[PDB]
Amino acid sequence: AFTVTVPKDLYVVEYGSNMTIECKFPVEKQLDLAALIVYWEMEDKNIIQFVHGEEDLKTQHSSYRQRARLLKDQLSLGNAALQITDVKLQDAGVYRCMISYGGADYKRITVKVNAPYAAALHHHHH
Amino acid sequence: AFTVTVPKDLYVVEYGSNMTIECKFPVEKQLDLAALIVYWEMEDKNIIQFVHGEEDLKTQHSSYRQRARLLKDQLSLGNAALQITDVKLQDAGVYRCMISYGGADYKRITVKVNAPYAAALHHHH
Ligand SMILES: CNCc1ccc(-c2cc(Cl)cc(Cl)c2)o1
């Protein structure tokens, strides 16, 4: 049946770098945007809603506001990759890619985030 | 748009009893079963799948074998209620009710489970 697949489920990213986590689903013929739902979340924090044609951000968590860009271009190729700019220590954890396009599945992807000493020191308080 | 709503988000059940946690979604007219999906899952343990008219248990987690039953009747009124039989403390935690019906949402429900001394004594060892 319908199945979202993840090129890798573990990404290890350095502090402050960019990060594109990929998520592929099948595109029958040409992608029907009105029938598509894409939904990126990370440990109960809603990162991105893509519902029947456009992005819902009025539900986006604060900690991700204007850092999480869903590549509206690669949706037409069945790749819902999420791009996060300037990664922080807080961004490490289990991400969930949930897709509903005549069927629905999800996959988990883990991010560990490396940081130099100074970053890990400021995260130890702030 | 589409909205899954949960009558309670906290259940407190005593040990060894049964428990039905409800989950409602909108029913427009007559229900389209082939397009309906019901995932009931609990902290990365899948409890119940409902795809194209039937329950899939091909991934039902060990902890739930023939104890977790989704009431197929109440689907027709948009009621995704889940029954867990003779609950153990391993069942305390946060459940996710996920529904895909021309649109999609989910909600969380937390279960705390109270138990007498001997039962806990076991979950310890
Ligand atoms: C906040 N958007 C909720 C959302 C988007 C996609 C899903 C979903 C639903 C089901 Cl029934 C199954 C699977 Cl695998 C995923 O839920």
From Swiss-Prot, chain A:
The chain holds residues 18 to 134 of 290 of the full protein. Ubiquitinated; STUB1 likely mediates polyubiquitination of PD-L1/CD274 triggering its degradation. Ubiquitinated by MARCHF8; leading to degradation. Deubiquitinated by USP22; leading to stabilization. Belongs to the immunoglobulin superfamily. BTN/MOG family. Interacts with PDCD1. Interacts (via transmembrane domain) with CMTM4 and CMTM6. Interacts with (phosphorylated) STAT3; promoting nuclear translocation. Interacts with CD80. The gene is CD274. This is Programmed cell death 1 ligand 1. Induction: Up-regulated on T- and B-cells, dendritic cells, keratinocytes and monocytes after LPS and IFNG activation. Up-regulated in B-cells activated by surface Ig cross-linking. Highly expressed in the heart, skeletal muscle, placenta and lung. Weakly expressed in the thymus, spleen, kidney and liver. Expressed on activated T- and B-cells, dendritic cells, keratinocytes and monocytes. Residues 2-110 form the Ig-like V-type domain.
